[PDB]
Amino acid sequence: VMNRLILAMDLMNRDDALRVTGEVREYIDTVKIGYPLVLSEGMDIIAEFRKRFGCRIIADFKVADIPETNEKICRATFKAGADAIIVHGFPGADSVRACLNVAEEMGREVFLLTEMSHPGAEMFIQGAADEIARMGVDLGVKNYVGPSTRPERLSRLREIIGQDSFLISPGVGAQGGDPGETLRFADAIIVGRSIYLADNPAAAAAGIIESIKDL
Amino acid sequence: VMNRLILAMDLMNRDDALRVTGEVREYIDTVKIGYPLVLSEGMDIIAEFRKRFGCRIIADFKVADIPETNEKICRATFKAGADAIIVHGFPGADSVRACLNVAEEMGREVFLLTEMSHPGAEMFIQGAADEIARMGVDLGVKNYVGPSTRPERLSRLREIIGQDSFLISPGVGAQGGDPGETLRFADAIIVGRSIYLADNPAAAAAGIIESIKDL
Numbered sequence: 001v002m003n004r005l006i007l008a009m010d011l012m013n014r015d016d017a018l019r020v021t022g023e024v025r026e027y028i029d030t031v032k033i034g035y036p037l038v039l040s041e042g043m044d045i046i047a048e049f050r051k052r053f054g055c056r057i058i059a060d061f062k063v064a065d066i067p068e069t070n071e072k073i074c075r076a077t078f079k080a081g082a083d084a085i086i087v088h089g090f091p092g093a094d095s096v097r098a099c100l101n102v103a104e105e106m107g108r109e110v111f112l113l114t115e116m117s118h119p120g121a122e123m124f125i126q127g128a129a130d131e132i133a134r135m136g137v138d139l140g141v142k143n144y145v146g147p148s149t150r151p152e153r154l155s156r157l158r159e160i161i162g163q164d165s166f167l168i169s170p171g172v173g174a175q176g177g178d179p180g181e182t183l184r185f186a187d188a189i190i191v192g193r194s195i196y197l198a199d200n201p202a203a204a205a206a207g208i209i210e211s212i213k214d215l
Numbered sequence: 216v217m218n219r220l221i222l223a224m225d226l227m228n229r230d231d232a233l234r235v236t237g238e239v240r241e242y243i244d245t246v247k248i249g250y251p252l253v254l255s256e257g258m259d260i261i262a263e264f265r266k267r268f269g270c271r272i273i274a275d276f277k278v279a280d281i282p283e284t285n286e287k288i289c290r291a292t293f294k295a296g297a298d299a300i301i302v303h304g305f306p307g308a309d310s311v312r313a314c315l316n317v318a319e320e321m322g323r324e325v326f327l328l329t330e331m332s333h334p335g336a337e338m339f340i341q342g343a344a345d346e347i348a349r350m351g352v353d354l355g356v357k358n359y360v361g362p363s364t365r366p367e368r369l370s371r372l373r374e375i376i377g378q379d380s381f382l383i384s385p386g387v388g389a390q391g392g393d394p395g396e397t398l399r400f401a402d403a404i405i406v407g408r409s410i411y412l413a414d415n416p417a418a419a420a421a422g423i424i425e426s427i428k429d430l
C-alpha cells in the first residue's frame with residue numbers, strides 16, 4: 001500500500017469525497033469505501049473512484065450475514081469493482097467461507113475483521129478475537145483487520161496470523177491510535193477523519209507519511 | 216405485522232423484486248430489504264417500495280461498525296425512507312446506542328439482532344447472545360431478532376426481553392425453521408426464499424398464513 005496509508009473515505013457527499021480523495025491521491029494507492037458513502041451516493045461510486053484515481057478499493061462492508069446472503073453481498077460488491085471486501089469473523093466460519101468462495105470465483109480478496117477498535121469491542125468481540133483470527137488462519141485467510149487503539153491486541157493478532165499475512169489497522173488519529181506504534185505490527189494504517197475533516201487533507205496526509213518514513 | 220409474516224426481499228433484480236412483492240402484498244404489511252437488493256439497485260428502491268406497496272420497510276443492514284460510522288449508516292438509511300433498521304449487538308453497547316440515538320432523532324426504530332440463525336452462529340454469537348439481549352434491555356431496545364432455527368434459543372431470548380418487546384425471527388423455510396413453532400415465541404416470522412423462489416410466491420405465502428391462522 002503506497003506509504004502504508006489507506007484513506008477511509010467516509011464523507012457522504014460525492015463532491016466532497018472526490019475533492020478530498022483527489023487532494024490526497026499523491027500520498028496513498030488504496031481507498032477504503034464504506035456504507036456512509038455507498039448508501040448516500042450509490043455503488044457506482046466505486047467504479048468512479050477506481051477509474052478516476054487509479055486506486056485500489058477496499059469495500060469496508062463488515063459483512064455479517066448468513067452464508068447465502070453473504071455470497072450475494074460479495075458478488076454485488078465485486079461486480080461494482082471493489083478489489084477487496086472486509087468481512088466480520090464473529091458470524092463464524094461458514095459465513096466467512098461464503099465470502100472466500102465468491103472472492104475465489106471473481107479473482108478478489110477478503111479481509112477478515114477480527115477485533116474492532118471502538119470501546120464497545122471489549123464487551124463481546126475481544127474475548128472471541130483470538131479464536132476468530134485462528135479461524136481465519138484455518139480457512140486460509142491472508143488479509144486481516146485489527147485495532148490501532150489496542151497495540152497489544154494488534155501484536156497478539158500478528159502473532160496468530162504470522163508475518164506473511166497482510167494486516168491493516170483502523171483507529172489511527174481520531175480514535176486515539178498512533179501511526180508509528182500501529183505500524184510496529186500492521187502493514188498499513190487506515191485513516192479517516194484525521195485526513196478528511198482536516199482543514200488541509202493533503203497536509204494532514206503528508207504529515208502522517210512524514211511520520212511513517214521516519215520509522 | 217399483517218399475518219405475522221414479513222417478506223425478506225433478497226432478489227437482486229428490481230423487476231423480479233417488484234413482481235414478487237406485488238404478488239404477495241395482499242398477505243404481508245412489512246418487507247425486509249437488505250444489501251442484496253440495495254447494493255444491486257440503489258437505496259432509492261426503499262422509497263419506491265414503501266410508496267408502491269404502502270408497506271413498512273425494515274432495512275436488514277446488520278449494522279456492525281464503530282459508533283460514529285453506525286450513526287452515518289443509520290441516518291442514510293432513515294433518509295432513504297426505512298421505518299426500522301436491524302443492528303448487530305455483538306459490537307457492543309456504544310455501537311447500539313449510536314443507532315438508537317439516530318432513530319430517536321428521526322422518529323424511527325432499531326431492531327437488535329442478538330443470535331443469528333445459521334450454523335456458524337454457534338461458534339461465537341450464541342455464547343454471547345443472552346448477554347447481548349440483556350444489553351439491549353438495559354439500553355431500552357424494544358425490538359429484537361432471533362433465530363427460527365433454534366426455538367429453545369428463541370424461547371430464552373423471549374424470556375430475557377419479556378412479553379412486551381417485539382420479536383421477529385428469520386430462518387423459516389429454507390433454513391429449516393417452522394412457522395408455527397417459531398410463533399410460539401416470536402411475534403412475526405421472516406420468510407425469504409420459501410416465498411420468493413417459489414413457482415407461485417402468492418400460493419407459498421398463502422400456505423404459510425393458512426398455517427399461522429391455524430395457530
Ligand SMILES: O=c1ccn([C@@H]2O[C@H](COP(=O)(O)O)[C@@H](O)[C@H]2O)c(=O)[nH]1
Nearest residue numbers: 008116117170171174191192193281284
Ligand atoms: O474496527 C474497526 C473496523 C473498521 N473501522 C472503520 O475504519 C474507519 C476509521 O475511520 P477514522 O476513525 O480514522 O475516521 C471508519 O471507516 C470505520 O468505519 C474502524 O474504525 N474500526
Ligand SMILES: O=c1ccn([C@@H]2O[C@H](COP(=O)(O)O)[C@@H](O)[C@H]2O)c(=O)[nH]1
Nearest residue numbers: 066069223331332385386389406407408
Ligand atoms: O440471523 C439472521 C439474520 C438475518 N437473516 C436474514 O433473513 C433472511 C432469511 O431469508 P430466507 O432464509 O428465508 O431466504 C435473509 O435476508 C437473511 O439475510 C437471517 O436469515 N438470519
